[PDB]
Design a protein around this ligand. Structure first.
Ligand SMILES: *[C@@H]1O[C@H](CO)[C@@H](O[C@@H]2O[C@H](CO)[C@@H](O)[C@H](O)[C@H]2NC(C)=O)[C@H](O)[C@H]1NC(C)=O
Ligand SMILES: *[C@@H]1O[C@H](CO)[C@@H](O[C@@H]2O[C@H](CO)[C@@H](O)[C@H](O)[C@H]2NC(C)=O)[C@H](O)[C@H]1NC(C)=O
Ligand SMILES: *[C@@H]1O[C@H](CO)[C@@H](O[C@@H]2O[C@H](CO)[C@@H](O)[C@H](O)[C@H]2NC(C)=O)[C@H](O)[C@H]1NC(C)=O
Ligand SMILES: *[C@@H]1O[C@H](CO)[C@@H](O[C@@H]2O[C@H](CO)[C@@H](O)[C@H](O)[C@H]2NC(C)=O)[C@H](O)[C@H]1NC(C)=O
Ligand code: NAG
Ligand code: NAG
Lengths: 1043, 37, 50
């Protein structure tokens, strides 16, 4: 049952793991907590549950057999081999002596495991979960030595090259072992060993595992160690160990056959291990000749001693624990109902190990160990590990070696071998106490030589634990690690830190180049709209979609919750979702086609006069809206544009909503409004925005009332009444987002002092290049670094060279390479042109500030942060003082009349835009989650238009007119709440920078110029980019974390 | 469950659908911005 | 193991729950009560038999 047991995964129950070939490799090499725990629980259940009744029956039968034999117990018979009436008390004293070393080692390893696995599955005052260590039974901790190596810079000792350098093979190893033995007056080894034994089998059958075997044919001339000798340091040590076994056999092979097998079970392993440890010393290795040069340092010594400690000290509690439980079971002190209770009591008490899952009496965790079913005593290994160091210390004292005990050797110390032979020849004739007294002078087992051997490692461990302030031992003995989330089915997830770092490095490397190529292609298509450029842009779009799908699917195998970091965790979280790439191939093609169709039918739309003339939006329809003061012309333009664009887009919009909702659901979000609101990482974004708007409402209401009064003064009373909304087209935009920015109708009081920003630009020689240069100069003077020089001669800002100039409106471009910061906008020359220029230079400087960041975080702290940072300086520049400094004349605050006029002009923008921005994006959110159906798209749009804004449709509308489709951002499918958020927080940033500028006064006219402290404060928070959540950067800029 | 309510009026729903199809009436009110005065 | 009861709240090595019993600080042996409870019924059965 032990041999045939296997653990199989919950699914795909075709073939499944066994212990020795499979389970050992995963439980030694893997570092996934879920996988390690799955293997541990599966193996222990599988091998333990069906072994309990058999063990109870065997216990009863064996006890009865040996009671008939004379012993009171089976455990009494097992203890009778050592013939010590107080064996248990001696073992308890030995473990109490070895306790401090194990406590220091246990605390150190627990600290390392807590660093690796985090303070939720492992706490620093408590036991270590059983599976986390190297072994399945926590027996030895070698496989954990990767995270525990002390000062790993010094390479570990090995002569792996030297056996290939000079011919060693296999026969010579036994020759050097034999001559080393003869260098101690130990008896020579008979010729039957040489050719009669086995060392390597070319084709004579399929050899056994042959890890270790020494044979003692009872005829006084036959001795074999089948080993399958290799050429390795540990192979040489095992050669010496097995030859020590054989030397024991040969030297004590004089007494009768009954008086054999050594003084007690545990003398043979000790005798072999003494020579095995004394041979691996560097000094003896050098004296043999396998180590050419003898370097020296305490670091390699500490490394070797810690590896030895992990091998042996980690085992000693287990060896004592296994037999203690079996003695308790055999004696009857543990009925077949406290098997697991007493087993885990012992495991926690002696080893400090905690079960990873809750166990109870249906389980048999002792049956998972090999020696419990295949009934074999276990305390021989404990006794041998103690005796080996006792013997070694005694031999080195007799050998005359002075110094550290672990570096001692007995080579060419024949004087020390005489007493070794004297003890060895005894065999089982005398009680082992007398033999030990002969060898060392002590009667019983002692742990003093063991502690003396491990003195340097234990001193280093004590110093490290005291420095780290760890508590030795495990208080909170009740603590048990929590079950991992979705444990039974989430086991095949990579949670390794090195793997995540490799993935993030590879993703950054490939994404940098693919996105740089995409930036080049986008620039070329932007400035060179043609057929070949469009085709190359489309092929690059397909390439980027395939790359994003591949790397997102790769990152979806990771477990972002179990990673212990911030940067890589953020990167994996960001790349884990697929930007519309989660859709199936047919769905993705349809989604791209519908997006392109909506963008196209919005871009090429034109409204034609009855006489035949046709007008596009961007060149003249916007102008015929901004400059005309005739009700019929405005109504014709408004209605015609809304009709054409909206009725074109309405045919496609419902399908687009369904597809984007499907993609955002496949990405783990809900209904594609959550996907858009998750850019701000605030779960309560909607409430915050509503509160901000409610704060802003009274000022907008006052401005709306004043503008309505002025418009009634102009247009009369038939078209506008003083109680009620204003028609949506009498304001100055096709959408009334920035209404009456053309404010000649609403100017508060037209005083004689009045600047002409639009006319001053034409009057002066303000070329676009020179004003862009002036913006750069002001940006530099603020305290921020300039743009690289090639930006001026590499970017275009004047005019196109193709059939279509550009799309209606776009933004700045970054190439992710740390060198290209191109700009695209060109709108002749105007005041609005100056402010848009300053906005785009702010955008470029934001793009350039985080060049040192990884590509995945090369995105900006918040979607609205980009616009806010770009526009705070533009807000500062538009002041009357800074406009006075630059080709204009303005009295600034000297004339309060002109100040009120400037404030009104600056308020007709940035107010009446806040309601519109929130309005359009809010409408979209309600459409995306099904609150607004296809039937009442227009109804709900105009309800929001009347509620938040104060506008009414100039002409009656019907279902079937898609007015929201006249905006550019609705068919282009770009979020809009970024503009509301940016308009809200750019004034916060202006206030903070003015406060840092050293003066406050009239904030509405305060300007930042040569204020290096404010620029530095802005730079220290613009540079984090997306690496940290938005509130941190907002607090760094301002102090108040929230909007 | 509203299914029993729909089953109660199923003959009427069928006849109403037939009559509306024959008269060519558009369900709903796709002139929502309409008031009598 | 013997009584079959659990702590209502989690304990650790900081606590000393054995000292809450009167006999532990006021050092007095306690197995005399177990022995007497076992013995009194033996005496009763023997007397009833006789
Ligand atoms: C392993 O190789 C060793 C040498 O590396 C072989 O033993 C030696 O063979 C050479 C042949 O030139 C002799 O001169 C030596 O006397 C041999 N003995 C020693 C101790 O060096 C050996 O035969 C090889 N063994 C196997 C099993 O293939
Ligand atoms: C390497 O240096 C160590 C000391 O760092 C040497 O240890 C000395 O060992 C000799 C006997 O071999 C003692 O007499 C000295 O007292 C030891 N020194 C200390 C500081 O304990 C060691 O022998 C050197 N060589 C090797 C090969 O390890
Ligand atoms: C864990 O995150 C930290 C930062 O929070 C990383 O530290 C730096 O990470 C960057 C980006 O990978 C590297 O360029 C630096 O070399 C890292 N610095 C140091 C001192 O290590 C850290 O690398 C992350 N851990 C892993 C395993 O990637
Ligand atoms: C033993 O457990 C007690 C009770 O849980 C611990 O005392 C609490 O410790 C936590 C962690 O510091 C504090 O937040 C609580 O306020 C403590 N409660 C009280 C009543 O003091 C105690 O720290 C644990 N001791 C050890 C050695 O692990
Ligand atoms: C734009 O494309 C045309 C194709 O005729 C080519 O001649 C021209 O050089 C291109 N311009 C740039 C700046 O690449
Ligand atoms: C994207 O990769 C898939 C992998 O199967 C490939 O079949 C497909 O052709 C690729 N797409 C394009 C447009 O080349």
């Amino acid at each position: 049952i032990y041999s045939t047991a296997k653990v199989c995964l919950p699914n795909k129950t075709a073939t499944c793991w066994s212990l020795d070939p499979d389970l050992t490799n995963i439980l030694a090499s893997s570092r996934s907590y879920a996988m390690l725990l799955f293997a541990w629980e599966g193996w222990h259940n599988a091998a333990g549950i069906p072994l309990k009744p058999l063990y109870e029956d065997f216990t009863a039968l064996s006890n009865e057999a040996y009671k008939q034999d004379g012993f009171t117990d089976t455990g009494a018979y097992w203890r009778s081999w050592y013939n010590s009436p107080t064996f248990e008390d001696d073992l308890e004293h030995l473990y109490q002596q070895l306790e401090p070393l194990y406590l220091n080692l246990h605390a150190f390893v627990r600290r390392a495991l807590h660093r690796r696995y985090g303070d939720r599955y492992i706490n620093l005052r408590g036991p270590i979960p059983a599976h986390l260590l190297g072994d399945m039974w926590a027996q030895s901790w070698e496989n954990i030595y990767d995270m525990v190596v002390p000062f790993p810079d010094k390479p570990n000792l090995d002569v792996t090259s030297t056996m290939l350098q000079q011919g060693w093979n296999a026969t010579h190893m036994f020759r050097v072992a034999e001559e080393f033995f003869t260098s101690l007056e130990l008896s020579p080894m008979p010729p039957e060993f040489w050719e009669g034994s086995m060392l390597e089998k070319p084709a004579d059958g399929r050899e056994v595992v042959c890890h270790a075997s020494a044979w003692d044919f009872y005829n006084r001339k036959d001795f074999r160690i089948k080993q399958c000798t290799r050429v390795t340091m540990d192979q040489l040590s095992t050669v010496h160990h097995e030859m020590g076994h054989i030397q024991y056999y040969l030297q004590y092979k004089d007494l009768p056959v009954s008086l054999r097998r050594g003084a007690n079970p545990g003398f043979h392993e000790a005798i072999g291990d003494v020579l095995a440890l004394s041979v691996s010393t560097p000094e003896h290795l050098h004296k043999i000749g396998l180590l050419d040069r003898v370097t020296n340092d305490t670091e390699s010594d500490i490394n070797y001693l810690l590896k030895m400690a992990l091998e042996k000290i980690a085992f000693l509690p287990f060896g004592y624990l296994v037999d203690q439980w079996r003695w308790g079971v055999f004696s009857g002190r543990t009925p077949p109902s406290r098997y697991n209770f007493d087993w885990w009591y012992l495991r926690t008490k002696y080893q400090g190990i905690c079960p990873p899952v809750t166990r109870n009496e249906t389980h048999f965790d002792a049956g998972a160990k090999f020696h419990v079913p295949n009934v074999t005593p276990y305390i021989r290994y404990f006794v041998s590990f103690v005796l080996q160091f006792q013997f070694h210390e005694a031999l080195c004292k007799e050998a005359g070696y002075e110094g550290p005990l672990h570096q001692c050797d007995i080579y060419r110390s024949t004087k020390a071998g005489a007493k070794l032979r004297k003890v060895l020849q005894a065999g089982s004739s005398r009680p082992w106490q007398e033999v030990l007294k002969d060898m060392v002078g002590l009667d019983a087992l002692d742990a003093q030589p063991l502690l003396k051997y491990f003195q340097p490692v234990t001193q280093w461990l004590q110093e490290q634990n005291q420095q780290n302030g760890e508590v030795l031992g495990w208080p909170e003995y009740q603590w048990h690690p929590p079950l991992p989330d979705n444990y039974p089915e989430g086991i095949d997830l990579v949670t390794d830190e090195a793997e995540a770092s490799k993935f993030v490095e590879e993703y950054d490397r490939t994404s940098q180049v693919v996105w740089n190529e995409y930036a080049e292609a986008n620039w070329n298509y932007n400035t060179n709209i043609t057929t070949e450029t469009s085709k190359i842009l489309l092929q690059k779009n397909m390439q980027i979609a395939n790359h994003t799908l591949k790397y997102g699917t790769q990152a979806r195998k990771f477990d972002v919750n179990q990673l212990q970091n911030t940067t890589i965790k953020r990167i994996i979280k960001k790349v884990q979702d697929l930007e519309r790439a989660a859709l199936p191939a047919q769905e993705l093609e349809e989604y791209n086609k519908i997006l392109l169709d909506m963008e196209t039918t919005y871009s090429v739309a034109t409204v034609c006069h009855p006489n035949g003339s046709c007008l596009q939006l961007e060149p003249d329809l916007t102008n015929v809206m901004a400059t005309s003061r005739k009700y019929e012309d405005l109504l014709w333009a408004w209605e015609g544009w809304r009709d054409k664009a909206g009725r074109a887009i309405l045919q496609f919009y419902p399908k687009y909503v369904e597809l984007i909702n499907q993609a955002a659901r496949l990405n783990g979000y809900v209904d594609a409004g959550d996907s858009w609101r998750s850019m701000y990482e605030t779960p309560s974004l909607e409430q915050d925005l509503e509160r901000l708007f409610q704060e802003l409402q009274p000022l907008y209401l006052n401005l709306h009332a004043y503008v309505r009064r002025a418009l009634h003064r102009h247009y009369g009373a038939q078209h506008i009444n003083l109680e009620g909304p204003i028609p949506a087209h009498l304001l100055g935009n096709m959408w009334a987002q920035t209404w009456s920015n053309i404010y000649d109708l609403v100017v508060p009081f037209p005083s004689a002092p009045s600047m002409d920003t639009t006319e001053a630009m034409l009057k002066q020689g303000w070329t676009p290049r020179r004003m862009f240069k002036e913006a750069d100069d002001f940006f530099t003077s603020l305290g921020l670094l300039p743009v690289p020089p090639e930006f001026w001669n590499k970017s275009m800002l004047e005019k196109p060279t193709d059939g279509r100039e550009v799309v209606c409106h776009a933004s700045a471009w970054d190439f992710y390479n740390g060198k290209d910061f191109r700009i695209k906008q060109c709108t002749t020359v105007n005041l609005e042109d100056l402010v848009v220029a300053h906005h785009e230079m702010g955008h470029i400087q934001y793009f350039m500030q985080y060049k040192d960041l990884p590509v995945a975080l090369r995105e900006g702290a918040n979607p609205g942060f980009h616009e806010a940072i770009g526009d705070v300086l533009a807000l500062s520049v538009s002041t009357p003082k800074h406009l006075h400094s630059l080709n204009l004349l303005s009295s600034e605050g000297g004339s309060d009349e002109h100040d009120i006029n400037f404030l009104m002009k600056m308020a007709l923008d940035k107010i009446a835009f806040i309601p519109f921005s929130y309005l359009v994006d809010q409408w979209r959110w309600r459409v995306f989650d099904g609150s607004i159906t296809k039937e009442n798209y227009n109804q709900e749009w105009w309800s929001l238009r009347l509620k938040y804004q104060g506008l009414c449709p100039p002409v009656p509308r019907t279902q079937g007119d898609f007015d929201p489709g006249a905006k550019f951002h609705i068919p282009s499918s770009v979020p809009y709440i970024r503009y509301f958020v940016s308009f809200i927080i750019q004034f916060q940033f202006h206030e903070a920078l003015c406060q840092a500028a050293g003066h406050t006064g009239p904030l509405h006219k305060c300007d930042i110029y040569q204020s290096k402290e404010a620029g530095q404060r802005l730079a220290t928070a613009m540079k984090l980019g997306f690496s940290r959540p938005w509130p941190e950067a907002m607090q760094l800029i301002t102090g108040q974390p929230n909007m | 469950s509203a299914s029993a309510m729909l089953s109660y009026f199923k003959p009427l729903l069928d006849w109403l659908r037939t009559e509306n199809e024959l008269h060519g009436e558009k369900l709903g009110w796709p002139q929502y911005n309409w008031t009598p005065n």
